[PDB]
Structures are given as C-alpha cells and as structure tokens.
Write a protein that binds this ligand. Sequence first.
Ligand SMILES: [Mg+2]
Ligand SMILES: [Mg+2]
Ligand SMILES: [Mg+2]
Ligand SMILES: [Mg+2]
Ligand SMILES: [Mg+2]
Ligand SMILES: [Mg+2]
Ligand SMILES: [Mg+2]
Ligand SMILES: [Mg+2]
Ligand SMILES: [Mg+2]
Ligand SMILES: [Mg+2]
Ligand SMILES: [Mg+2]
Ligand SMILES: [Mg+2]
Ligand SMILES: [Mg+2]
Ligand SMILES: [Mg+2]
Ligand SMILES: [Mg+2]
Ligand SMILES: [Mg+2]
Ligand SMILES: [Mg+2]
Ligand SMILES: [Mg+2]
Ligand SMILES: [Mg+2]
Ligand SMILES: [Mg+2]
Ligand SMILES: [Mg+2]
Ligand SMILES: [Mg+2]
Ligand SMILES: [Mg+2]
Ligand SMILES: [Mg+2]
Ligand SMILES: [Mg+2]
Ligand SMILES: [Mg+2]
Ligand SMILES: [Mg+2]
Ligand SMILES: [Mg+2]
Ligand SMILES: [Mg+2]
Ligand SMILES: [Mg+2]
Ligand SMILES: [Mg+2]
Ligand SMILES: [Mg+2]
Ligand SMILES: [Mg+2]
Ligand SMILES: [Mg+2]
Ligand SMILES: [Mg+2]
Ligand SMILES: [Mg+2]
Ligand SMILES: [Mg+2]
Ligand SMILES: [Mg+2]
Ligand SMILES: [Mg+2]
Ligand SMILES: [Mg+2]
Ligand SMILES: [Mg+2]
Ligand SMILES: [Mg+2]
Ligand SMILES: [Mg+2]
Ligand SMILES: [Mg+2]
Ligand SMILES: [Mg+2]
Ligand SMILES: [Mg+2]
Ligand SMILES: [Mg+2]
Ligand SMILES: [Mg+2]
Ligand SMILES: [Mg+2]
Ligand SMILES: [Mg+2]
Ligand SMILES: [Mg+2]
Ligand SMILES: [Mg+2]
Ligand SMILES: [Mg+2]
Ligand SMILES: [Mg+2]
Ligand SMILES: [Mg+2]
Ligand SMILES: [Mg+2]
Ligand SMILES: [Mg+2]
Ligand SMILES: [Mg+2]
Ligand SMILES: [Mg+2]
Ligand SMILES: [Mg+2]
Ligand SMILES: [Mg+2]
Ligand SMILES: [Mg+2]
Ligand SMILES: [Mg+2]
Ligand SMILES: [Mg+2]
Ligand SMILES: [Mg+2]
Ligand SMILES: [Mg+2]
Ligand SMILES: [Mg+2]
Ligand SMILES: [Mg+2]
Ligand SMILES: [Mg+2]
Ligand SMILES: [Mg+2]
Ligand SMILES: [Mg+2]
Ligand SMILES: [Mg+2]
Ligand SMILES: [Mg+2]
Ligand SMILES: [Mg+2]
Ligand SMILES: [Mg+2]
Ligand SMILES: [Mg+2]
Ligand SMILES: [Mg+2]
Ligand SMILES: [Mg+2]
Ligand SMILES: [Mg+2]
Ligand SMILES: [Mg+2]
Ligand SMILES: [Mg+2]
Ligand SMILES: [Mg+2]
Ligand SMILES: [Mg+2]
Ligand SMILES: [Mg+2]
Ligand SMILES: [Mg+2]
Ligand SMILES: [Mg+2]
Ligand SMILES: [Mg+2]
Ligand SMILES: [Mg+2]
Ligand SMILES: [Mg+2]
Ligand SMILES: [Mg+2]
Ligand SMILES: [Mg+2]
Ligand SMILES: [Mg+2]
Ligand SMILES: [Mg+2]
Ligand SMILES: [Mg+2]
Ligand SMILES: [Mg+2]
Ligand SMILES: [Mg+2]
Ligand SMILES: [Mg+2]
Ligand SMILES: [Mg+2]
Ligand SMILES: [Mg+2]
Ligand SMILES: [Mg+2]
Ligand SMILES: [Mg+2]
Ligand SMILES: [Mg+2]
Ligand SMILES: [Mg+2]
Ligand SMILES: [Mg+2]
Ligand SMILES: [Mg+2]
Ligand SMILES: [Mg+2]
Ligand SMILES: [Mg+2]
Ligand SMILES: [Mg+2]
Ligand SMILES: [Mg+2]
Ligand SMILES: [Mg+2]
Ligand SMILES: [Mg+2]
Ligand SMILES: [Mg+2]
Ligand SMILES: [Mg+2]
Ligand SMILES: [Mg+2]
Ligand SMILES: [Mg+2]
Ligand SMILES: [Mg+2]
Ligand SMILES: [Mg+2]
Ligand SMILES: [Mg+2]
Ligand SMILES: [Mg+2]
Ligand SMILES: [Mg+2]
Lengths: 204, 137, 159
Amino acid sequence: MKGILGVKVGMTRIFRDDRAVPVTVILAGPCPVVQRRTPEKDGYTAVQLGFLPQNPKRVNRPLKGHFAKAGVEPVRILREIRDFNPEGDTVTVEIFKPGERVDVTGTSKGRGFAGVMKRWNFAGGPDSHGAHKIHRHPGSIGNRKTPGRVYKGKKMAGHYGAERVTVMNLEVVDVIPEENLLLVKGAVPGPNGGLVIVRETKKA
Amino acid sequence: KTYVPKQVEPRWVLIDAEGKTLGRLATKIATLLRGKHRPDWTPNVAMGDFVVVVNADKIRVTGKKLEQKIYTRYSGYPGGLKKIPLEKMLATHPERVLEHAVKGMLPKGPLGRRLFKRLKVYAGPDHPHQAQRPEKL
Amino acid sequence: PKGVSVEVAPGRVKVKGPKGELEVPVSPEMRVVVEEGVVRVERPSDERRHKSLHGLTRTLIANAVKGVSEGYSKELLIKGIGYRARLVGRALELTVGFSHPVVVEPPEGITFEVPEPTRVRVSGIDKQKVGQVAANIRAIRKPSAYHEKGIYYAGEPVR
RNA sequence: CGGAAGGGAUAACCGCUGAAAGCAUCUAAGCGGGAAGCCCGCCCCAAGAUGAGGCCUCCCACGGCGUCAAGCCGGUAAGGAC
RNA sequence: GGGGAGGUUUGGCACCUCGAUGUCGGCUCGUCGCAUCCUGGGGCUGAAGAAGGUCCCAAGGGUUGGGCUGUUCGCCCAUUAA
RNA sequence: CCGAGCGCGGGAACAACCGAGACCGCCAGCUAAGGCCCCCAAGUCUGGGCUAAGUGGUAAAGGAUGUGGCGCCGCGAAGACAGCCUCACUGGUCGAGUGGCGCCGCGCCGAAAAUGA
Ligand SMILES: [Mg+2]
Ligand SMILES: [Mg+2]
Ligand SMILES: [Mg+2]
Ligand SMILES: [Mg+2]
Ligand SMILES: [Mg+2]
Ligand SMILES: [Mg+2]
Ligand SMILES: [Mg+2]
Ligand SMILES: [Mg+2]
Ligand SMILES: [Mg+2]
Ligand SMILES: [Mg+2]
Ligand SMILES: [Mg+2]
Ligand SMILES: [Mg+2]
Ligand SMILES: [Mg+2]
Ligand SMILES: [Mg+2]
Ligand SMILES: [Mg+2]
Ligand SMILES: [Mg+2]
Ligand SMILES: [Mg+2]
Ligand SMILES: [Mg+2]
Ligand SMILES: [Mg+2]
Ligand SMILES: [Mg+2]
Ligand SMILES: [Mg+2]
Ligand SMILES: [Mg+2]
Ligand SMILES: [Mg+2]
Ligand SMILES: [Mg+2]
Ligand SMILES: [Mg+2]
Ligand SMILES: [Mg+2]
Ligand SMILES: [Mg+2]
Ligand SMILES: [Mg+2]
Ligand SMILES: [Mg+2]
Ligand SMILES: [Mg+2]
Ligand SMILES: [Mg+2]
Ligand SMILES: [Mg+2]
Ligand SMILES: [Mg+2]
Ligand SMILES: [Mg+2]
Ligand SMILES: [Mg+2]
Ligand SMILES: [Mg+2]
Ligand SMILES: [Mg+2]
Ligand SMILES: [Mg+2]
Ligand SMILES: [Mg+2]
Ligand SMILES: [Mg+2]
Ligand SMILES: [Mg+2]
Ligand SMILES: [Mg+2]
Ligand SMILES: [Mg+2]
Ligand SMILES: [Mg+2]
Ligand SMILES: [Mg+2]
Ligand SMILES: [Mg+2]
Ligand SMILES: [Mg+2]
Ligand SMILES: [Mg+2]
Ligand SMILES: [Mg+2]
Ligand SMILES: [Mg+2]
Ligand SMILES: [Mg+2]
Ligand SMILES: [Mg+2]
Ligand SMILES: [Mg+2]
Ligand SMILES: [Mg+2]
Ligand SMILES: [Mg+2]
Ligand SMILES: [Mg+2]
Ligand SMILES: [Mg+2]
Ligand SMILES: [Mg+2]
Ligand SMILES: [Mg+2]
Ligand SMILES: [Mg+2]
Ligand SMILES: [Mg+2]
Ligand SMILES: [Mg+2]
Ligand SMILES: [Mg+2]
Ligand SMILES: [Mg+2]
Ligand SMILES: [Mg+2]
Ligand SMILES: [Mg+2]
Ligand SMILES: [Mg+2]
Ligand SMILES: [Mg+2]
Ligand SMILES: [Mg+2]
Ligand SMILES: [Mg+2]
Ligand SMILES: [Mg+2]
Ligand SMILES: [Mg+2]
Ligand SMILES: [Mg+2]
Ligand SMILES: [Mg+2]
Ligand SMILES: [Mg+2]
Ligand SMILES: [Mg+2]
Ligand SMILES: [Mg+2]
Ligand SMILES: [Mg+2]
Ligand SMILES: [Mg+2]
Ligand SMILES: [Mg+2]
Ligand SMILES: [Mg+2]
Ligand SMILES: [Mg+2]
Ligand SMILES: [Mg+2]
Ligand SMILES: [Mg+2]
Ligand SMILES: [Mg+2]
Ligand SMILES: [Mg+2]
Ligand SMILES: [Mg+2]
Ligand SMILES: [Mg+2]
Ligand SMILES: [Mg+2]
Ligand SMILES: [Mg+2]
Ligand SMILES: [Mg+2]
Ligand SMILES: [Mg+2]
Ligand SMILES: [Mg+2]
Ligand SMILES: [Mg+2]
Ligand SMILES: [Mg+2]
Ligand SMILES: [Mg+2]
Ligand SMILES: [Mg+2]
Ligand SMILES: [Mg+2]
Ligand SMILES: [Mg+2]
Ligand SMILES: [Mg+2]
Ligand SMILES: [Mg+2]
Ligand SMILES: [Mg+2]
Ligand SMILES: [Mg+2]
Ligand SMILES: [Mg+2]
Ligand SMILES: [Mg+2]
Ligand SMILES: [Mg+2]
Ligand SMILES: [Mg+2]
Ligand SMILES: [Mg+2]
Ligand SMILES: [Mg+2]
Ligand SMILES: [Mg+2]
Ligand SMILES: [Mg+2]
Ligand SMILES: [Mg+2]
Ligand SMILES: [Mg+2]
Ligand SMILES: [Mg+2]
Ligand SMILES: [Mg+2]
Ligand SMILES: [Mg+2]
Ligand SMILES: [Mg+2]
Ligand SMILES: [Mg+2]
Ligand SMILES: [Mg+2]
Ligand SMILES: [Mg+2]
C-alpha cells in the first residue's frame, strides 16, 4: 500500500492534449522513514513517515532520541502510512506514475457553528407567506408522547467541517520530481498550505 | 450474634471448559464467583474464588442453538439493534459466549460487577500461570 | 465387497483400492463389522433414527468400495446447432450460445474426457464428485424446454 | 470524486449423494449453487473499551517528618502551564 | 358456505384526562412496519422470443414537476425504473 | 373479595387470582400458596414414560409417510411387498413381511406490524 505525506499547494488547470483539466498541486516532499511497525512488536505492519525539516528549537523534546535512533533529520510532522513497506531510507513522488489513481486524506475547512441549513442542507421555512421567525429553522424534531424523545443522531445545527475527509480515486495527472510536486484531479479537501496524505486507491 | 469473617485470601481456581454444556457450567462458575460454597458466606463482601476458564472456544451446547439462538446488542441509534447468532460468536471472540452466560447469572448490583471481574475466561488452554492452577471439574 | 481395503476408525471407515482412497464419514453409533471379505453394517435398536442411518452408511461404504475398484463416471450429451464440446488438456471448454465459451476446469480427483464434440466423460472415484460436477455442467446450459438444445444426460428430452 | 469490485454466510428456489421405505425422494446424516438483503469490504468516530489497550524515545532516588502502613512538606528532572 | 389475521376505516363501551390532552389541510423534519410501487433473486404459466400473468423471497436504496379544489382524496397534463 | 386488608407470602411487575385476617418485641421453630439450575431460600433428588418444535414461551377452520401407543380389516414362505419397464404372479430374488383404515399422547404447517429485542 503506497503512500506519502505532503501539502496542498493550490490548484490550476492544464491541457491534456486538446482538453482542459482541473488540477491540484500537492507538495509530496521527501519523506524519511522514521520507524517501522511490525507484528513482531507492533501487531501490524506500517511505516512512520517524517515530513518537513524542523530546526532543533522545539526538538528539545525526547523526540531527539526517536530521531537519532533512526538517525534522520528531525522532521516537523510524522504520520503512519499503514501496510506500506518500502526500504530503509526515503519515499518520494517517485512512488506515483502518472495515470495511477490515488485516495487523498485531508482536513476540511472549518465552518465553525453551522446552521442546519448549511450543515445538512435542510429546506427551512419560506422567505414569505407567514412565520417570518423560522426562515432557516429545522422545524419539527419528533412525534408526540411516543417515543417522547428525539432520535439519537438527529441532524441538527453544530460544528461543520474541520474534520478528517478523504476524497477517493483521484487521477495522478502528472508528477515533477524536480520540485517534488504532484498533480491530481483537483478535488482535494482542506485549505492551501494544509497538510494531506496521498496513497494508492481501491478500485481493482 | 452471627459470625462475620475478616480479610481472607481468594482461592484461585482453574476449570477446563471443553466438553462442558454451556449454561450448566456457567451456573457453577457463578456460584464460585460468589462465596455461596464457603460456609462463612457473606452477601455484601466479594469473597468468591477467582475462577479461570480455558478452552472456552470448545463449549458444548445442545439442540440447534449455534445455528439459531441469537445475541442482540442495542446501539442508541434507530435500527441500532444488532443480532448475532451463537455460531458467529464462536467464530470470532468465543470466550464471550461463556462470559455473557456467567455475567447474566451474577447479581445486577455494583457488587455483581466486582465479581464479574474475578472471572477470567480464555480461548485456552494456557493463561497467566500466576499461582494456583487447581484443576476443577 | 471384494478388493476392499476398509479400516474402521473412531467414527469413519476408510476404503482403499487400485483407483485411490476415500474417507467415509459414518455415524459413531453404528457397528461397522469388517469381515474377512465382506463388511457389514449393524444398527443398535430398531428405532426410527437408526434405521435411516443404517441403510445410509450401508450404502456410503459400498459406494466408496465400488469407487476405488471400478469408479464412477457420468455421461453428458450436447445438443443444439452451434453447441459443441471440446477438451483442452484436462479442462473442458464448451460453446453453448453465450458470447463467451465456458471454461470449466476439473476439481481435484475429477477427470473428464471428450470422445466427441457431443459427449463428456466426467469420471472419478467418489460418487458425490461425479454426480455434482455432472449436473454442474448441465447447469451451464440446462435443456431447452421449447426445443432440443443445451446439455443433457442420457435420458429423454422435454419439448 | 462516491454508490463499487471482491471474500464469507444465506432467503425463496435449483441440485449432488442418500436412506427411513429393496423403488423413489434436495434431507432425516452429509455436500454444492443461490439475492440491490445479512457479515465483511469502502469512508468517519473511537481506550471513561474504569476491560481506561500498544509501540518508540526522554527523565529518575529522599531533602526533613510518619517508629507500623496509607501519607505530609520545600526544591527539582523530563516536560508542561501562564 | 366455513375459519382467521391485522387495529389504517365506520361503529360500540364511557376506563385516564373538564382547577384545559389546541381540533382539518399544508410546510419543515422525519423514523418505523411490509401485507413490495420500482430495482434484485426465484417457482409456475394458456412462458416461441420480446412482453406479460400469478405466487414466493427480499427494505438496501429509491418512489417527479404541474392544472382544479382549504381540501385529504380524486381527476387531469407531462413524465417515470416506480 | 376489594371498598375499609394498595398491611404480609405467591402470580416478573398488577385493588379484588392463589395463601392468609398484621396488639408489640425476638439474629427461634412449623407450614400455606408457590417453588427447590444461577440471578434468589430450598433436590442440577429417585423411579418410568413422552416431546426435537425453543414446542414448552400462550390462536382457528383445515391440511401432512412427524413421532410413539392401541385396535380391526385385507394379501403371504402354495414365496408373498418394492424394484428388477413393472403393480398381480411363478421360475427370478432380497425371499418375510406388506397394504388399507380407525383411536390416543406429544409435536408440524396454517402464523404478516409498525422506537430495540
Ligand atoms: Mg487555489
Ligand atoms: Mg520494538
Ligand atoms: Mg504498536
Ligand atoms: Mg509546537
Ligand atoms: Mg439553519
Ligand atoms: Mg453541504
Ligand atoms: Mg443550503
Ligand atoms: Mg438545499
Ligand atoms: Mg404570521
Ligand atoms: Mg408539540
Ligand atoms: Mg417512551
Ligand atoms: Mg468542529
Ligand atoms: Mg471522509
Ligand atoms: Mg491561496
Ligand atoms: Mg498558502
Ligand atoms: Mg447450584
Ligand atoms: Mg448474554
Ligand atoms: Mg446481591
Ligand atoms: Mg433487580
Ligand atoms: Mg447495570
Ligand atoms: Mg424459449
Ligand atoms: Mg457521478
Ligand atoms: Mg456480495
Ligand atoms: Mg475464500
Ligand atoms: Mg462458498
Ligand atoms: Mg448471515
Ligand atoms: Mg452457516
Ligand atoms: Mg440428487
Ligand atoms: Mg441435511
Ligand atoms: Mg422421519
Ligand atoms: Mg451445506
Ligand atoms: Mg463451497
Ligand atoms: Mg453454497
Ligand atoms: Mg442467482
Ligand atoms: Mg447477494
Ligand atoms: Mg450488485
Ligand atoms: Mg449496484
Ligand atoms: Mg434478510
Ligand atoms: Mg486514540
Ligand atoms: Mg488511555
Ligand atoms: Mg493510550
Ligand atoms: Mg535530556
Ligand atoms: Mg521516577
Ligand atoms: Mg537515572
Ligand atoms: Mg535513580
Ligand atoms: Mg542521589
Ligand atoms: Mg538526581
Ligand atoms: Mg503492609
Ligand atoms: Mg513555594
Ligand atoms: Mg517542584
Ligand atoms: Mg537530566
Ligand atoms: Mg524543556
Ligand atoms: Mg492550561
Ligand atoms: Mg504554553
Ligand atoms: Mg358467503
Ligand atoms: Mg362467498
Ligand atoms: Mg359467517
Ligand atoms: Mg386503533
Ligand atoms: Mg356516518
Ligand atoms: Mg374504534
Ligand atoms: Mg369516564
Ligand atoms: Mg358504568
Ligand atoms: Mg378536558
Ligand atoms: Mg397545560
Ligand atoms: Mg376538536
Ligand atoms: Mg378545527
Ligand atoms: Mg427530506
Ligand atoms: Mg426502515
Ligand atoms: Mg424495528
Ligand atoms: Mg426483478
Ligand atoms: Mg416470474
Ligand atoms: Mg403445471
Ligand atoms: Mg408457439
Ligand atoms: Mg409468445
Ligand atoms: Mg419506504
Ligand atoms: Mg407536484
Ligand atoms: Mg394546488
Ligand atoms: Mg373526499
Ligand atoms: Mg382513497
Ligand atoms: Mg374530492
Ligand atoms: Mg376515483
Ligand atoms: Mg417509462
Ligand atoms: Mg408505466
Ligand atoms: Mg420497468
Ligand atoms: Mg373485609
Ligand atoms: Mg402496597
Ligand atoms: Mg401507597
Ligand atoms: Mg407479589
Ligand atoms: Mg399481593
Ligand atoms: Mg385494596
Ligand atoms: Mg389485595
Ligand atoms: Mg393476619
Ligand atoms: Mg399493642
Ligand atoms: Mg408476636
Ligand atoms: Mg437473639
Ligand atoms: Mg404444623
Ligand atoms: Mg408439621
Ligand atoms: Mg437446587
Ligand atoms: Mg438479575
Ligand atoms: Mg440456591
Ligand atoms: Mg433435576
Ligand atoms: Mg426422569
Ligand atoms: Mg418452527
Ligand atoms: Mg392473536
Ligand atoms: Mg399452534
Ligand atoms: Mg380463535
Ligand atoms: Mg372455532
Ligand atoms: Mg383445536
Ligand atoms: Mg389443531
Ligand atoms: Mg385426512
Ligand atoms: Mg417435525
Ligand atoms: Mg402409530
Ligand atoms: Mg397385491
Ligand atoms: Mg397370472
Ligand atoms: Mg427370493
Ligand atoms: Mg379397506
Ligand atoms: Mg375407534
Ligand atoms: Mg412457523
Ligand atoms: Mg416477513
Ligand atoms: Mg415484531
């Protein structure tokens, strides 16, 4: 199971032959394998990738040891690509030939406290013809004496977005190892500068 | 005035499960979990032996049961009622089927739970070889 | 029951012969007396349950015997214009109408020949294997009920 | 960009072998196939899973009291908070 | 002609509520039932095929926009896998 | 009988169903109903049957080679019942049982609902 950390840099269209294409750039960056998990003493297989250089300032932590034990430049971020297992060194955009398709996990932008209208796309009241003080309200939330309670998981206004989202099966449109870039079909969650993790898809 | 016992030591026991009829075994297990066999029995203390079970994956059960007979859990959500047959229980974590029997056989109070913890069930054989492994049948 | 290489187990007879070996799961609650040259099946009580199990095992053991000695084999008859049989090394492949020729390999122990693009020598030691794989082929294209097409055994059509 | 593919167990139903019942029978022992449904699979939450899990790395003595045991009080360590 | 199931209709009874349990229709939000409208799997057919008919299995999801009327319903227009 | 015994024991919980009419006290005994595998006091008691449906754990007309028990009526070693195209039947042959009805006990189908069992 391939994989790699990186940042959403932004997006812009290109031209596959004569045909416009929406594309989002991800900075795959160089990822130093910081540690390996294994059934031997982890109960599962997985690779802890590092990402982005961190000056020894806040590294004052015991992280210095976790870093030295693998003898690697102290990184700023590090997540586990599960079931990935490359080779004691580093993974880069080279993992992805253009044409392959990849799932991409990021964190959605944060709507904060969002109304039922935006959160759940409820219909709410009419702008006119009566009521007036319910234009964007949810209306009824139950029945009567039976059940005599609101259902668990009722769609109601709350915090929206700012959560782990994963769009799937995006096409790797292109890859430029020179600048450590990666191009895909654009639709990747989170804000620019947002961290994200690309990986092989499921389809066959 | 009736005798009250003091701080005594728990007698760790070890029961082989395979072959035994589910409910029948659970009953005895429960009794051991409470005192109820020790003549200094005290209803409000927790003084039942630490029962340990092994080979639970091989509990016998009459009739069709396995095929039929189903365990139901209820999530809080609508439709949240899950139903799982005895078959598939053993397929995965099987010590469950014995536990769910002994548990349902313990008193429902705060003490009941204390006791339910003294019951150690394993797919077996083998287990924490701490101290006493007093075979029992 | 000659040529028998039977052997009673805690709960399953085991016949053997020039053709192979087959384990025959028999209910423990039955006397499988192995005579010097003619195995017998004894049943405790005249009860209902036991009758059924008697006659059953009585046959399963005989079925294993005739198997490792003679062996079993079913005969499948192709019909219809385009329809035609054809062997491929050891796996049978046949056209029957679908936009793709059906490729059916033999399960372990099973072995079918094709003496003609209109017959199938499904052959094996176990009666179950045969009877199964037999119908498993006829299934690929059951008999046309309105004509005279598709797979057949050796018994009259439908029409 | 998604509903899947795929694996498993099945419903109606389709069978194999097969008695009770010398025949027959998908069934009573046993075996195969079979649904947008079931269990997985996909995505998300998740160890207050008080049954509070695991792995990697970092820090480590007591300084005066409690004669018993559970503790109390000043400065620290990794590190954390303001 | 005979026996039932259901508790959606029309009724019977007057047991809670008269120091108050707001009544129809619409909207919003739905959730459950299956005796299934569609899609899925099947048996039979007076099933050539295509399409139907009838019964069986099966809630997973789905189940349109308007004209008239307060209407529910119904009729009608244009569609629909429904 | 409740009302006035919504005081006590049983019936899961339940005025009037089963037991029984509470003067007070007791860390004594005996029984009632109902029970004696665990939750929960008391037999996983003894002897003999029946049931394979979770019946039991609460439905009908009606239907069926479910399963035990009982009875009568037809064929047969003068060879009978199945299948060997066969049923009848002789040589065949397993050859000794077989076919029809009726009565009883327990079960089966008939048997679809709305928050989670
Ligand atoms: Mg941009
Ligand atoms: Mg390790
Ligand atoms: Mg680990
Ligand atoms: Mg920081
Ligand atoms: Mg809103
Ligand atoms: Mg939205
Ligand atoms: Mg909106
Ligand atoms: Mg909207
Ligand atoms: Mg108004
Ligand atoms: Mg209200
Ligand atoms: Mg309620
Ligand atoms: Mg939030
Ligand atoms: Mg997501
Ligand atoms: Mg920007
Ligand atoms: Mg930026
Ligand atoms: Mg006991
Ligand atoms: Mg349980
Ligand atoms: Mg208690
Ligand atoms: Mg209670
Ligand atoms: Mg509780
Ligand atoms: Mg045709
Ligand atoms: Mg689309
Ligand atoms: Mg599937
Ligand atoms: Mg497999
Ligand atoms: Mg399979
Ligand atoms: Mg299943
Ligand atoms: Mg199964
Ligand atoms: Mg068959
Ligand atoms: Mg069977
Ligand atoms: Mg029978
Ligand atoms: Mg099977
Ligand atoms: Mg299989
Ligand atoms: Mg199968
Ligand atoms: Mg199918
Ligand atoms: Mg399916
Ligand atoms: Mg499908
Ligand atoms: Mg689909
Ligand atoms: Mg289902
Ligand atoms: Mg966590
Ligand atoms: Mg924790
Ligand atoms: Mg933890
Ligand atoms: Mg240090
Ligand atoms: Mg320390
Ligand atoms: Mg030290
Ligand atoms: Mg030290
Ligand atoms: Mg020191
Ligand atoms: Mg020090
Ligand atoms: Mg001590
Ligand atoms: Mg201070
Ligand atoms: Mg300090
Ligand atoms: Mg230090
Ligand atoms: Mg520090
Ligand atoms: Mg703070
Ligand atoms: Mg701070
Ligand atoms: Mg009439
Ligand atoms: Mg009529
Ligand atoms: Mg009438
Ligand atoms: Mg009603
Ligand atoms: Mg009227
Ligand atoms: Mg009424
Ligand atoms: Mg009244
Ligand atoms: Mg009155
Ligand atoms: Mg009123
Ligand atoms: Mg009020
Ligand atoms: Mg009114
Ligand atoms: Mg009104
Ligand atoms: Mg809606
Ligand atoms: Mg539903
Ligand atoms: Mg429900
Ligand atoms: Mg269909
Ligand atoms: Mg049809
Ligand atoms: Mg017909
Ligand atoms: Mg015609
Ligand atoms: Mg036609
Ligand atoms: Mg619906
Ligand atoms: Mg409309
Ligand atoms: Mg209108
Ligand atoms: Mg009307
Ligand atoms: Mg109407
Ligand atoms: Mg009208
Ligand atoms: Mg009308
Ligand atoms: Mg149409
Ligand atoms: Mg139409
Ligand atoms: Mg259609
Ligand atoms: Mg009185
Ligand atoms: Mg009272
Ligand atoms: Mg009161
Ligand atoms: Mg009571
Ligand atoms: Mg009472
Ligand atoms: Mg009263
Ligand atoms: Mg009373
Ligand atoms: Mg009295
Ligand atoms: Mg007095
Ligand atoms: Mg007195
Ligand atoms: Mg006293
Ligand atoms: Mg007396
Ligand atoms: Mg007396
Ligand atoms: Mg007892
Ligand atoms: Mg209880
Ligand atoms: Mg007891
Ligand atoms: Mg007993
Ligand atoms: Mg007895
Ligand atoms: Mg039943
Ligand atoms: Mg009823
Ligand atoms: Mg009944
Ligand atoms: Mg009735
Ligand atoms: Mg009647
Ligand atoms: Mg009756
Ligand atoms: Mg009846
Ligand atoms: Mg009759
Ligand atoms: Mg039955
Ligand atoms: Mg009888
Ligand atoms: Mg005759
Ligand atoms: Mg004659
Ligand atoms: Mg003869
Ligand atoms: Mg007669
Ligand atoms: Mg009579
Ligand atoms: Mg039923
Ligand atoms: Mg149903
Ligand atoms: Mg129900």
